[PDB]
Structures are given as structure tokens and as C-alpha cells.
Design a protein around this ligand. Structure first.
Ligand SMILES: Nc1ncnc2c1ncn2[C@@H]1O[C@@H]2COP(=O)(O)O[C@H]2[C@H]1O
Ligand SMILES: [Ca+2]
Ligand SMILES: [Ca+2]
Ligand SMILES: [Ca+2]
Ligand SMILES: [Mg+2]
Lengths: 146, 735
């Protein structure tokens, strides 16, 4: 049951990468359409979706072909929120960032004795832009990024 | 709060090592007594006269009682104290020495002492007998009538019993003392003078050094917080606007502790405060009637809507009754209507509160009826006598907004089903939120799961694993057949509350029927006052939506308690289409964060549905394409900023590598803003996406080397036909 608004996107994005301007996107394109939207199906998990409906040049998928396939894994998932709440939780001080200090802090109350060496560690691998701290964006990345 | 300030780092150690040789002699705590009084000590180079950047015209010299004795020659001075709000001691030193005739440093001692007397113990707490009787040792206790060095022109009065009779009049002269007693105790030279001559003041000071200064230093420290804090009326003054049934509030007082979790409730109507203790049931989710604030029915949910708050709105009622009807029409057996029966106490209550007036009697069919009067102008009411039923009817000169008119009938209230007995309904306790100790949640995860998670290698995954656990056992919220939408522990908590107010003496079942208002995403309501109950047993009722949000930040959020705020805060809530603001830190940092591919696409996808025109049209113009191709380009650059393989790099590079990715974006943006006719709707957004990048890119700079500005750094680049060495150019731009 994707909300209408949930279509605006799944198209405003679907189309942006439809180079040849028609209404069907190649495999690699679907791959891109999605990633751009914030996901990434695996190299092989990417086929099962496009594969089930071969009513094309045995390789492409149209607009509906798409919208109707964004259910298989989108008519259940509501985790997005939880994770945004988990964030506000560690971001103890409300700066919008999660500092190695608080990570280790909230980590222990929740019961985990973390080594000063393996916290300045997580915070690092989680940090993508190099500013020593993890914002909501990098957090969400780290979290869901399977 | 750093106390001492050194103005001119001009001399060598000679000056420095002199201000040190100075403070190392004053008792650390006497300083903590200063810093508390918001004081700050000022040491300077050669500023004698009114030359210091803080020695001009504020609270200067009024009445002349100045140094030890009295001299008032300011000019020549080197030590001064700005007396009026926040003490400011100012000291200058010149050449080598204070130690020959220390009779000079003494003033930096008493001159100081004038900081803590009048605020010390001499009078802050008040002159307490301690110094009130110790000052009395003028001449009566010990055989040492030696007080010549503190009592002259104001107390050469050896002929007077100095108790409370005359020590108030001149608080000042008894400061010129404590001060000279201090200067004398800590003066690097004359220490025994106050031991030989004053026999007690000495002990006095000594005790103070022994631990007295820390006394007050801790009595001003404690009133440091209790002073400036969040004005919430605590104690029982809250429980007053709380509406909760005292025995219950107190009853809850015990659960917050054991479990350790703040319980926050919304305003419970007072005209229900007793209908509860009494034994009346509470409105659950199945009922959406309106209560009443007048008449006999008041405090109950009339079945007759026109007998509630919405008395007149020919639709709140016409679509109000329409509500109760269905309430039964559907859940029959559990939700029904029963006749009103105001008991004994209740009547006497709605009395002094002024809702009804019991007066003249009447008789019909043989039964007695005391008449109940209410200054309404459409319904007349009457209770019975046998069974205290109640009845109404339209007056012989009025109608009902819907168009009805009737004779005496029994007033029907709504009533759920309690142990097979339709009990009447009044307001329920609606929880505003539940804040459990961040640890209490751990005591929620089954020892093996939390185990199988931490016994993992991957430092990164050991977090994800945890967080998800914290989420699965703490934050997650499933819906529910009966109790609204609430957490799992939230339900467990929801039980302990009800069973707790049952071993107390309640007979209407549960008094908390559904999850926390911070899930009432649909029709969220903004309550000003909010009764809270810390994990200790103190009733605190906030007073603002802010204070409330402020009290949660200070005592809950930032104090190790898991709290989560209403999903619909900051957005427009569908149902009542309402916007309720609540400080979201994530949003705080949005201003300086480069957007995400998807955050971007999304926003475009939005404006489309707004101005019915998208960034690029499906047309033949080859410029539209251009524009299209272009956004597909930014869509990348952004998506490229947030790459997970930025991890095999060094913190350093991460900033560089990303500042570029950033900049690249700011470019293709700069490219379209200077394009064909992209509507303004988009002209604006892009206008905005820039400030982001910029800020984000600026921030990534001030983390490492910050003499460089975005504007400039940009200029120096060449995004024309060759990007190759441009990055190489970028590197050298930071050295
Ligand atoms: N799970 C829930 N937690 C909190 N409030 C809820 C929940 N489910 C519904 N609500 C709404 O909270 C509202 C506040 O007052 P009402 O009793 O008039 O109606 C209530 C419901 O509409
Ligand atoms: Ca195509
Ligand atoms: Ca932080
Ligand atoms: Ca970061
Ligand atoms: Mg309710």
C-alpha cells in the first residue's frame, strides 16, 4: 500500500535514471534507481525482482513493473523510525551528533563494558566524512547497511 | 568557572611566581567560596589607578570606611574590590617584595575577607549564635579583654552587652573584624598575633580552615542548583492540579521506584478526581463521548451529548451523540448506558464547587424528589429519594438545539463493563509518557540474546546488534486489540499501575487504559501542565510545553532514561491536522549537513506535486534533457559523499575526499542555478541545497586547517574541461 506521495518518489527517481526517455529501465538502471533512493539490492538479489515478470525484451522493467515490485520488501518494513529514535538515544547531549564519549557511555548502562580502544574504533568505522563524529545520516547507513 | 585572571604576562616568573606565592597561601576553599559568589580575582601589571578595564564608575566609593584603619586615598591603592553583585577583586604587583613588611599583603587578605564576611557566616546564614556569641567575647567569656585590633571607634563601647540588642545596627563593623581576623590568620607573617591576642576568633578561623569554609562552600554550592532550576511546583501543590486521586498518586509513587521510571500524566479533570476514588470506571478507547463541566451529570459522560461541554454546537452534539450510539452499537455488552445515581458525598461536593444547588422539594406519583437547580437555560434537573436517580426535561419555555422537547426522564451516562456490571464512565488517567531507566530495559532482554550479540567479533556489528536489541526491547511499538498502540514493557508497566491502585481500594478495574500520549500520532494534544513522578517519589507538575520539554531534556533525556517523543511532533498530524513543535536535535544539525541522494530526489519529488512542474520536463527541448542529465549528476555526487568505503581511509583523507565530493555537488548545482528556466520553486531549493553543502564543506574544513574559506577555496578550482589535476590542485590548497 504505497502512499501516493510514496509514488512521487518511486517515479521522480525511477525516471531520472531512465536515460533513453521511454518508460522501462534496464537491470543496471533499476540497480541504480534503488541505490539512489537509499537501498541496495545485492548483485544477485537484484534479479529475482526483475526476473519474475519477463514480459519485456527479457531484461527490462517499466513504471508499473517497478511500483508493483516495491512491496516484496516494502509492505512490511517500518524500521526506519526505530533507528531514528535509537539515534536520539545515544546522541545524549542533543547536538545531532554521536560522540565516542556517549557511545561508550550509553553502551555501558545498557550493560556493555567497552574498551576505550574499541569505541574510538566504532565511531571511526561509522564515520564517512571524517569529522570524528557520527550524524544521523552515517548512523542510518551503518545500522541498516547489511 | 576559572577564578583567577592574569592580565599582563609581562614580568617573568617574578610577577607570576608572585601571584602564585600569593594564592597558595589562601585556603583553596575560601576561593571556592569566591567562585561560587561568581567572583573572579584580577591580577594585573601596572594599573594602579582607575585604569583597569573594569575599574571605572559602577558601585564605587560611597561611605569612607576603607582599609584596616581608615584612609580613603584610593589613588595610591593596589588592591580593590568591586562590592555590589558579583565580587571582583583586583590586584596589581610591581617589583620584587611583599615579604619584608607583609603589612602590605595583609590588605590583599582582608581586602579579600570583605568578600566572605557579609556573605561568609558572619551573616549569610545569619550572624548565627556562633559569631553572635563569639563577637560577644568582647569581654565576658575568657580573661582576654583584648579586642583592641578590631573594635575601636565603633566598639570601644566596653560598656554594653553586645548580643542581639545592638549588633544588627552595624553589620559593617563586624565585617571589618572577620576580615582583619582573616588577614591576620593567613598573613604570611603575623599568625600567632591572633592566637596570643584574640583567643577565640583564632579558634573560630581555625575551625573554619579545619572545615568551615567548606561548610558554606557547600551550602552555596547546594543552593547553586536549587537556586537556578526549572520552576515546577513540586510536592503536593502539583497533586492539586494533578487531578489524580491522592491515594493513587501515592500508590504509583512506589512503582516508579522499584522499576525506576518516570511516570508522566496529562491533566485529569478535577470533577472526576473523586468519581474515581469513589469507584467509577474510566473511559477507555471504545468511548469518544465528551465529558461535562456542569449540571448533575458533570464528571460523567452523558449519553445525551447536549448535557456535556459541547452544549449548543448543534453539530459537536449532532455528531457527538452519533458517537456514543456507535460506542454501544458496536461493542455491545462491554459499552452501554445506565441511569445516573449521584451518591451522598458527590452531591455535597458539586455544591461548594458550585455546579448544583440543592433546594426546594416536590412530589410526584407519591415519591419524594429533592429539586436540583442549575443556572442553565434549557434543562431542569431533579434527583430522586428512594434510589438517588436523577432526571431532566426541556423547560416549558425552551427547546433542544436538535429540535427536541421532553418531560422528566432519567439521565443516562455511559458505562463500560466491569466484572459483568455496567459501571458508569468518567475520565481515565492518560499517560503522557513513560521514561524507564536505560538499564531497566537491559533487565528486559533475555540473558542469552543480549549474550549471543556481545560475544561477536566485529566491533561495528557489535553495535548494530546492541542498538537493534535496545530497539527491539525498548523503542519498538506494536499496535493492540485493546490497549491502543504501546510498547511491551509499557504494557507491563501499564499493568503494575492498575494492580497497584487496586490493592489500595479501587472497584472500577483499571484506571490507565492505553499507551502513552506520545503515540497518539493521530489526534495529538498539547497540554501545558504535566504531572510527573521521578523514580524516587516526588510529584512534579511542570507548567509549560517548553518547561515540560525542558524538564525532560535535563532530568530524563540527558540523565540515562530511555525517552522517545511523538512521531507526529514537528509534522502536521493527519487526524486533527495539528502542528506541535518539539526540539529535534537531528534537525538541529541539518543546517550543516550535505543532503543524501534520496533526501534530494525526495525533495524534488515533492515540489513536483506542489508547483505542478518538475525540474525537467518530458519534452524535445535539448536543454530540458541537459537539466535532467545534470540532476542525475548531483544525485550521484551526493550519493558519493556518503560512501561506506570511506572507512579504508584515514580520518584526514575522509575530510578531504569528502570536501571534494561535496564541492563537486555545489558545482553541478551552481551549474543548474545558472541554467534555463528551472522554475523558482526549484531555484529556491537549490538556493538552499547550497547553503548546506557549503556549511558541510565549511565544517569539514574547521576540523583540520581553518584559514581557508569556502568562497575562496572554490575560486581557486577549475571545473571546465579537465578535472584530473584539479583534485591534485585541491590537495595543495590545504598546506
Ligand atoms: N495507544 C495510544 N496511546 C496514547 N493515546 C492514544 C492511543 N491510542 C489512541 N490514543 C488517543 O489518545 C486520545 C486522548 O484522549 P481521548 O480519550 O479523547 O482519545 C484518545 C485516543 O484517541
Ligand atoms: Ca529506458
Ligand atoms: Ca552528541
Ligand atoms: Ca561524521
Ligand atoms: Mg483515555
Amino acid at each position: 500500500q504505497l502512499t501516493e506521495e510514496q509514488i512521487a518518489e518511486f517515479k521522480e527517481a525511477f525516471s531520472l535514471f531512465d536515460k533513453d526517455g521511454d518508460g522501462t529501465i534496464t537491470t543496471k538502471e533499476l540497480g541504480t534507481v534503488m541505490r539512489s533512493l537509499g537501498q541496495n539490492p545485492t548483485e544477485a538479489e537484484l534479479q529475482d525482482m526483475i526476473n519474475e515478470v519477463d514480459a519485456d525484451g527479457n531484461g527490462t522493467i517499466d513504471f508499473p513493473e517497478f511500483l508493483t515490485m516495491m512491496a516484496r520488501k516494502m509492505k512490511d518494513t517500518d524500521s526506519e523510525e526505530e533507528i531514528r529514535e535509537a539515534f536520539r538515544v545515544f546522541d545524549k547531549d542533543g547536538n545531532g551528533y554521536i560522540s565516542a564519549a556517549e557511545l561508550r557511555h550509553v553502551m555501558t548502562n545498557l550493560g556493555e563494558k567497552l574498551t576505550d580502544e574499541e569505541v574510538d574504533q566504532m565511531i571511526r568505522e561509522a564515520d564517512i566524512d571524517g569529522d570524528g563524529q557520527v550524524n544521523y545520516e552515517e548512523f542510518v547507513q551503518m545500522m541498516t547497511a547489511k | 568557572n576559572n577564578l583567577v585572571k592574569t592580565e599582563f604576562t609581562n614580568e617573568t616568573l617574578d610577577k607570576i611566581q608572585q601571584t602564585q606565592d600569593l594564592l597558595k597561601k589562601i585556603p583553596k576553599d575560601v576561593l571556592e567560596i569566591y567562585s561560587e559568589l561568581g567572583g573572579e580575582i584580577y591580577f594585573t601589571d601596572i594599573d594602579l589607578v582607575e585604569h583597569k578595564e573594569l575599574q571605572d564608575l559602577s558601585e564605587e566609593e560611597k561611605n569612607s570606611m576603607n582599609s584596616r584603619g581608615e584612609k580613603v586615598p584610593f589613588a595610591s591603592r593596589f588592591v580593590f574590590e568591586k562590592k555590589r553583585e558579583t565580587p571582583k577583586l583586583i590586584i596589581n604587583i610591581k617589583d620584587y617584595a611583599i615579604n619584608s613588611e607583609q603589612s602590605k599583603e595583609v590588605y590583599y587578605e582582608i581586602g579579600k575577607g570583605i568578600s566572605l564576611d557579609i556573605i561568609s557566616k558572619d551573616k549569610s546564614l545569619d550572624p548565627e549564635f556562633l559569631n553572635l556569641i563569639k563577637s560577644l567575647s568582647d569581654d565576658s567569656d575568657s580573661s582576654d579583654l583584648l579586642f583592641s585590633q578590631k573594635f575601636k571607634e565603633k566598639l570601644e563601647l566596653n560598656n554594653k552587652s553586645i548580643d542581639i540588642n545592638f549588633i544588627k545596627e552595624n553589620l559593617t563593623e563586624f565585617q571589618h573584624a572577620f576580615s582583619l581576623a582573616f588577614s591576620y590568620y593567613f598573613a604570611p607573617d603575623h599568625r600567632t598575633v591572633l592566637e596570643l591576642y584574640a583567643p577565640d576568633m583564632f579558634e573560630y578561623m581555625n575551625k573554619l580552615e579545619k572545615g568551615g569554609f567548606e561548610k558554606i562552600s557547600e551550602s552555596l554550592k547546594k543552593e547553586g542548583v536549587e537556586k537556578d532550576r526549572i520552576d515546577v511546583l513540586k510536592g503536593e501543590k502539583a497533586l492539586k492540579a494533578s487531578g489524580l486521586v491522592p491515594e493513587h498518586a501515592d500508590a504509583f509513587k512506589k512503582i516508579a521506584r522499584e522499576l525506576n521510571t518516570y511516570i508522566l500524566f496529562r491533566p485529569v479533570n478535577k470533577l472526576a478526581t473523586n468519581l474515581i476514588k469513589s469507584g467509577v470506571a474510566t473511559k477507555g478507547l471504545n468511548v469518544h463521548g465528551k465529558s461535562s463541566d456542569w449540571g448533575p451529570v458533570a464528571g460523567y459522560i452523558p449519553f445525551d451529548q447536549d448535557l456535556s461541554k459541547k452544549h449548543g454546537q448543534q453539530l459537536a452534539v449532532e455528531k457527538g451523540n452519533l458517537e456514543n450510539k456507535k460506542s454501544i452499537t458496536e461493542h455491545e455488552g462491554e459499552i452501554g448506558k445506565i441511569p445516573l445515581k449521584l451518591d451522598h458525598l458527590r452531591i455535597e461536593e458539586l455544591k461548594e464547587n458550585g455546579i448544583i444547588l440543592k433546594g426546594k422539594k416536590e412530589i410526584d406519583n407519591g415519591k419524594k424528589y429533592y429539586l436540583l437547580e442549575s443556572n442553565n437555560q434549557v434543562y431542569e434537573f431533579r434527583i430522586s429519594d428512594e434510589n438517588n436517580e436523577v432526571q431532566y426535561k426541556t423547560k416549558e419555555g425552551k427547546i433542544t438545539v436538535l429540535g427536541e422537547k421532553f418531560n422528566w426522564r432519567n439521565i443516562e451516562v455511559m458505562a463500560k463493563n466491569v466484572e459483568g456490571v455496567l459501571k458508569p464512565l468518567t475520565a481515565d488517567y492518560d499517560l503522557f509518557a513513560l521514561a524507564p531507566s536505560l538499564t531497566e530495559i537491559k533487565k528486559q532482554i533475555p540473558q542469552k540474546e543480549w549474550d549471543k550479540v556481545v560475544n561477536t567479533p566485529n566491533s561495528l556489528e557489535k553495535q548494530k546488534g546492541v542498538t537493534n536489541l535496545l530497539i527491539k526491547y525498548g523503542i519498538e511499538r506494536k499496535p493492540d486489540s485493546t490497549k491502543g498502540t504501546l510498547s511491551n514493557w509499557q504494557k507491563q508497566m501499564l499493568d503494575r499501575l492498575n494492580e497497584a491502585v487496586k490493592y489500595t481500594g479501587y472497584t472500577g478495574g483499571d484506571v490507565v487504559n492505553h499507551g502513552t500520549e506520545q503515540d497518539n500520532e493521530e489526534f495529538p494534544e498539547k497540554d501545558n501542565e504535566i504531572f510527573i513522578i521521578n523514580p524516587e517519589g516526588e510529584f512534579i507538575l511542570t507548567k509549560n510545553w517548553e518547561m515540560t520539554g525542558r524538564f525532560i531534556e535535563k532530568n530524563i533525556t540527558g540523565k540515562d532514561y530511555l525517552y522517545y517523543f511523538n512521531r507526529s511532533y514537528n509534522k502536521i498530524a493527519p487526524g486533527n491536522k495539528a502542528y506541535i513543535e518539539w526540539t529535534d536535535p537531528i534537525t538541529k544539525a541539518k543546517i550543516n549537513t550535505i543532503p543524501t541522494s534520496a533526501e534530494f530526489i525526495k525533495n524534488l519529488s515533492s515540489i513536483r506535486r506542489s508547483s505542478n512542474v518538475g525540474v525537467y520536463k518530458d519534452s524535445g527541448d535539448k536543454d530540458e534533457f541537459a537539466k535532467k542529465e545534470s540532476v542525475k549528476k548531483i544525485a550521484g555526487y551526493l550519493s558519493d559523499y556518503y560512501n561506506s568505503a570511506n572507512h579504508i581511509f584515514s580520518q584526514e583523507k575522509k575530510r578531504k575526499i569528502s570536501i571534494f565530493r561535496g564541492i563537486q555537488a555545489y558545482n553541478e548545482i551552481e551549474n543548474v542555478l545558472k541554467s534555463k528556466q528551472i522554475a523558482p520553486e526549484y531555484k529556491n531549493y537549490f538556493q538552499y541545497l547550497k547553503e548546506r553543502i557549503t556549511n558541510q564543506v565549511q565544517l569539514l574544513l574547521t576540523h583540520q586547517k581553518s584559514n581557508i574559506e569556502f568562497k575562496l577555496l572554490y575560486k581557486q578550482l577549475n571545473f571546465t574541461e579537465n578535472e584530473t589535476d584539479n583534485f591534485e590542485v585541491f590537495q595543495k590548497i590545504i598546506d
